[PDB]
Design a protein around this ligand. Structure first.
Ligand code: ZN
Lengths: 140, 66, 100, 56, 185, 70, 55, 61, 143, 141
RNA sequence: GUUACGCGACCCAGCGGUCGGCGUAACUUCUUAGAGGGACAAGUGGCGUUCAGCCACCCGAGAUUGAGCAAUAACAGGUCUGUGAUGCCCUUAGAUGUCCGGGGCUGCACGCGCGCUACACUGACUGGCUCAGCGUGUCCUACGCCGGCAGGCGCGGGUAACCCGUUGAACCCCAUUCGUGAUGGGGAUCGGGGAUUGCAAUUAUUCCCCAUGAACGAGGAAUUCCCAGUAAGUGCGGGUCAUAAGCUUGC
């Protein structure tokens, strides 16, 4: 069999996508890709498909399992974990030029799709309520 | 704010005078040399000393160094 | 030949992994199969204190901390064999518990 | 039985109180420290000093 | 090809201003499917200059900290305000948004050098994003204690500023900051 | 202090079936302003002209609903 | 007092029941993990217990 | 009278609080004459300024 | 959705004159002793469809609504739901509405003052009752 | 062809299932359905006159995903934000007598059974009709 | 933990679709945590005494992450109410020792400081849908019955990557009702009832229900904090805790 499973993550939302050989199946936690909430962020999950075309997703089945984070973090985790899975599938089996043809499209559009943003929550300090904010000081 | 302190500049000059025959213009090569001839206590220091030796290798190659 | 599990809990990693790797190799010349040391996550104890004994000051705080490292190594052998490997001198920070 | 987050704590409270009594008791004969060897066999405590004959 | 909200093309969008065309980013390189990009813009200077101008707008709708991180709420405001601009005028709202920034850009300000002020010129990045400041706060206070909704008021604020009319809050504040600037040259 | 109609009288129901379907924009925020009617009529009134098919639904959301001429 | 009211007040909870195990203080006790030390006497012995100050 | 000018050099930041900066621009009528003006907001080299009142020459604030 | 001819702009179901323009679950809260929680279960026990405003109810329907709220034990409304529960004179479970709510407040406040309870002395002194701090708040109307 | 519950919209699926649970009128609706706040973090009665059918529909839908959910697992699903006037808000649980009478009325319809471990799991009869009601939602579009 | 496989449900025929249904074959990608690795201003181009260095760009996870530690000299800074750290003084049996009972530390013409909740439609309400992370536990809690609710009664589990717990958190998201009116915004004040903790609830301990429905329509002069996962919104732990967060400390 020809399968691969990569990850792609936002803050604490880790998403792993299993990429077998199959027929055009993209679903997340058992649910179809078009029915993932929030539906305001519908096109951010479809930026893998709308850029490259469905025909580059034709020979595979994609099954994304997602854990952690929040609603908006998990949308950016899925679209990264899809876009890194098709690159690993067109590398371990298909030619390096076929990888480079879609590596060029996914860097021209939204570098976040392949390189994870390293920003995490800066810790809270005892001066104030947040990381940087301080409690209000009074003189007289 | 990448100014190198005296403990990096003094240690790098004594290395080149003792081991000029081994050093080149590759950082990663001289990174492996600088841990071979020296008891450097930390890795982040080791990259700074090796990073200043390789900078000096170009100045030595063009002319003399004070 | 049955289940026998040894838990290794210490406060430092360096003394713990020295005791740890001493027990893997001890069952290797015994030709006793041993599943490698699984690593339980670190428990971290986080007392936070006001740092001045009076109450006057600019409200600094003192974050004490102590992390506990835990290791489990299991063998498959009767009690005739295992306790001899345990009987060696064990480093003073590391705690040993043998499960029957 | 006891919780192991409590067990490491109470062992620290053990040798802290132990080190504080031997500081007060052996203040006059160069006492320095206590090393603790809690074992399931006999627990040995080694008292470090420079006047052994006054510890004895 | 990349249509915003799946509906609005960026192909025919043209900037009829020489100055504000390096600094208004809606073309095919800057074409996105949603105005929720989650990009790192505020870590280097002038990197908001290549930020897409439709989602600098949705970032500025999150003010008055009652609704401060609710960016998904502000996308569906900008979504519905684009439907209304099409129903009222009949063209691509991305064209109307471009004309609402050009006509509302204060091209003369006045710094302080006790009271007397010197007329200075405005950089082409400042007069873009000060216009974004004016368009949103014109939409916000015109929608506050009114039954007229925020996506309705954001639409009409962009319609009136694209026409150059003196109805909207953005144009008359753009005109006030220039009249004060002219009287202390 | 403005008082609105909670129910249509005869002379404003006429404007509803005549003036309202000729608008480029039909939303309960605009319709309730031009007819001086309370905002819960303007939802019920525009769900009534939609059932006749005299207007065209272009979007629908829990925040607002947008119609147009037909 | 005599045997029936000299210590008769019930002390099974509250601050009257819990004292520092070192200096017999009643305030600022750290009850966490059975320490039962007042917070001043705690940070005196915090390294002898073995709490390493990392942050 | 329309005037469009192109920034060719940044000449440091001027002001009490340093709130603005001085530039050296070339007009787009002819690329020969150059005036110094003091613009506020972030400015790069090469971006276009529009000028209401030309010929003012911007003495130091 | 057109206005009826019998559309009552006002309704006097008690000594309170209530709006006819409000929806019926919220018009009858103008009556004292009826809040929004109580106003729904009276309208569920009368089976008025709550989408109707307070003007379009006929006189026979309003007569039924005022019957049910004045007799709550009879129409399957529980004892934990009422206003005066286990009354300090009769032991009754009743829902005082308009002036019976106003008359039994003073009857509860004069009873506390008559026996000179500490909760009754502070109603007479105009102070707070429920043990709040009075050093820094409630300074309105005290100068 | 073959459609499961997860293959279709969820917000329409409770609207299809609650019409089904009321149609086959065998569901045991208790007496106090007209006077409950439905949780002590709410403040009014639920606006739907028959909320029991749409609460029993969603409760039946949750057991298709995570079985072994007892009553204490059902107060967590229908928990929400309690506003405390001038004090800050907190999480608060749903009503236990609602979730108990819902699962017991789903027990008396033979959609659910009790489990060897805790909670109540669906029946194969319960897994049957949910996929069929989902087959009619996919039919509608 | 994953994948594979074996059964099992269900759907409509496939070495199909879903399953946190069940069991075991390879495996560490995801989880954990060890060892090493990695970034040095190294490379390129500028600028610079051609030094020290600086700017920009390539490549890259990263081209200043955030803390902790922190000198000499001080200050009549605070703490004798942390100490069986302590000099001197005072008291020492009708006690300034100590216990017990009751009260007070909450008292309200008023002034100020840190906060909380708000002034609503970018909202509230009622449903529906769907996502955390630190961390704690002999007290934490699963499940079953009872009650409308707070709660109660049974059975179990966890001294804890084992159980609670896949911590089904809020905001958000979708659908409802409302309609610019101190309104269904706001929830102060206060009446009546119901539970729980405790030796004791009155000066309401908290908790719940029903009623009551105040100022407040963005705040004068002033002034605080802050530049990136930051401000702000938003909820959740820990500390204090028999009962317990409008606080603080962390997530
Ligand atoms: Zn102490």
């Amino acid at each position: 069999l020809q399968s691969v499973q990569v990850f792609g993550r936002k803050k604490t939302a880790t998403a792993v996508a299993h990429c077998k050989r199959g027929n055009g199946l993209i679903k997340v936690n058992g649910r179809p890709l078009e029915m993932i909430e929030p539906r305001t962020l519908q096109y951010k999950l479809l930026e893998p498909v709308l850029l490259l075309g469905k025909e580059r997703f034709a020979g595979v089945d994609i099954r994304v399992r997602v854990k952690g984070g929040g609603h908006v973090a998990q949308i950016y985790a899925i679209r990264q974990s899809i876009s890194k899975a098709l690159v690993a599938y067109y590398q371990k089996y298909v030619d390096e030029a076929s990888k480079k043809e879609i590596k060029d499209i996914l860097i021209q559009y939204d570098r976040t799709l392949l390189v994870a943003d390293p920003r995490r929550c800066e810790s809270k300090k005892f001066g104030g309520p947040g990381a940087r904010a301080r409690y209000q000081k009074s003189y007289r | 704010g990448r100014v190198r302190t005296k403990t990096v500049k003094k240690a790098a000059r004594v290395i080149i005078e003792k081991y000029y025959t081994r050093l080149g213009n590759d950082f990663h090569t001289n990174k492996r040399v600088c841990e071979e001839i020296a008891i450097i206590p930390s890795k982040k220091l080791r990259n700074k000393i090796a990073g200043y030796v390789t900078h000096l290798m170009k100045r030595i190659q063009r002319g003399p160094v004070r | 030949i049955h289940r026998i599990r040894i838990t290794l809990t210490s406060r430092n990693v360096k003394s713990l992994e020295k005791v740890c790797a001493d027990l893997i190799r001890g069952a290797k010349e015994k030709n006793l199969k041993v599943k490698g040391p699984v690593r339980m996550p670190t428990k971290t104890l986080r007392i936070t204190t006001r740092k001045t004994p009076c109450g006057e000051g600019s409200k600094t705080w003192d974050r004490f901390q102590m992390r506990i490292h835990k290791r489990l190594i299991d063998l498959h052998s009767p009690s005739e064999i295992v306790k001899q490997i345990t009987s060696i001198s064990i480093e003073p920070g590391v705690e040993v518990e043998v499960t029957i | 039985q006891i919780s192991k987050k409590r067990k490491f704590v109470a062992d620290g409270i053990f040798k802290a109180e132990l080190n504080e009594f031997l500081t007060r008791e052996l203040a006059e004969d160069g006492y320095s420290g206590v090393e603790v060897r809690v074992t399931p066999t006999r627990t040995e405590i080694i008292i470090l000093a420079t006047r052994t004959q006054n510890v004895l | 090809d990349i249509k915003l909200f799946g509906k609005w093309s960026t192909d025919d969008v043209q900037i009829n201003d020489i100055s504000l065309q390096d600094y208004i980013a809606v073309k095919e390189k800057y074409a996105k499917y949603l105005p929720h990009s989650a990009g790192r813009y505020a870590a280097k200077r002038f990197r908001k200059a290549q930020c897409p101008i439709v989602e600098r707008l949705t970032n500025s709708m999150m003010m008055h900290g009652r609704n401060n991180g609710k960016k998904l709420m502000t996308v569906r405001i900008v979504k519905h305000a684009f439907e209304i601009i099409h129903l009222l005028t009949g063209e691509n709202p991305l064209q109307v948004l471009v004309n609402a920034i050009i006509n509302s850009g204060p091209r003369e300000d006045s710094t302080r050098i006790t009271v007397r002020r010197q007329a200075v010129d405005v950089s082409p990045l400042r007069r873009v994003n000060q216009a974004i400041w004016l368009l949103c706060t014109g939409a916000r206070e015109a929608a506050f204690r009114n039954i007229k909704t925020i996506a309705e008021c954001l639409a009409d604020e962009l319609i009136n500023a694209a026409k150059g009319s003196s109805n909207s809050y953005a144009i008359k504040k753009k005109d006030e900051l220039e009249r004060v600037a002219k009287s202390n040259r | 202090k403005l008082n609105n109609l909670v129910l249509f009288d005869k002379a404003t129901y006429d404007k509803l079936c005549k003036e309202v379907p000729n608008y480029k924009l039909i939303t309960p925020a605009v319709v309730s302003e031009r007819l001086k009617i309370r905002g819960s009529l303007a939802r019920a009134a525009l769900q009534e002209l939609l059932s006749k098919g005299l207007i065209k639904l272009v979007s629908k959301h829990r925040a607002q609903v947008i119609y147009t001429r037909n | 007092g005599h045997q029936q009211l000299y210590w008769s007040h019930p002390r099974k909870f509250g601050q009257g029941s819990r004292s520092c195990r070192v200096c017999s203080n009643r305030h600022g006790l750290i009850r966490k993990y059975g320490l039962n030390m007042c917070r001043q006497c705690f940070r005196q012995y915090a390294k002898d217990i073995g709490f390493i100050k990392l942050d | 009278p329309i005037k469009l000018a192109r920034v060719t050099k940044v000449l440091g930041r001027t002001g009490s609080q340093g709130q603005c900066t001085q530039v050296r621009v070339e007009f787009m009528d002819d690329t020969s004459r150059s005036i110094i003006r003091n613009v506020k907001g972030p400015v790069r080299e090469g971006d276009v300024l529009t000028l209401l009142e030309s010929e003012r020459e911007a003495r130091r604030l | 959705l057109v206005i009826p001819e019998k559309f009552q702009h006002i309704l006097r179901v008690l000594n309170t004159n209530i709006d006819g323009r409000r929806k019926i679950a919220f018009a009858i809260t103008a009556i004292k002793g009826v809040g929004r929680r109580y106003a729904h279960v009276v309208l569920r026990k009368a089976d008025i469809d709550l989408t109707k405003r307070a003007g379009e109810l006929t006189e026979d329907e309003v007569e039924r609504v005022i019957t049910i709220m004045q007799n709550p034990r009879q129409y399957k409304i529980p004892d934990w739901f009422l206003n005066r529960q286990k009354d300090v004179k009769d032991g009754k479970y009743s829902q005082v509405l308009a002036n019976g709510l106003d008359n039994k407040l003073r009857e509860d406040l004069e009873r506390l003052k008559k026996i000179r309870a500490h909760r009754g002395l502070r109603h007479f002194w105009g102070l707070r009752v429920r043990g709040q701090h009075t050093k820094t708040t409630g300074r309105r109307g005290r100068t | 062809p073959g459609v499961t519950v997860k293959d279709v919209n969820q917000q329409e699926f409770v609207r299809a299932l609650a019409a089904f649970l009321k149609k086959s009128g065998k569901l045991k609706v208790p007496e106090w359905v007209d006077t409950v706040k439905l949780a002590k973090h709410k403040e009014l009665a639920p606006y739907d006159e028959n909320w029991f059918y749409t609460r029993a529909a969603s409760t039946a839908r949750h057991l298709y995903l995570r079985g072994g959910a007892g009553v204490g697992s059902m107060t967590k699903i229908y928990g929400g934000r309690q506003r405390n006037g001038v004090m800050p808000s907190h999480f608060s649980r749903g009503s236990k007598s609602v979730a108990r009478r819902v699962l017991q009325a789903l027990e008396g319809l033979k959609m659910v059974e009790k489990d060897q471990d805790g909670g109540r799991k669906l029946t194969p009869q319960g897994q049957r009709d949910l996929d069929r009601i989902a087959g009619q939602v996919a039919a509608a579009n």
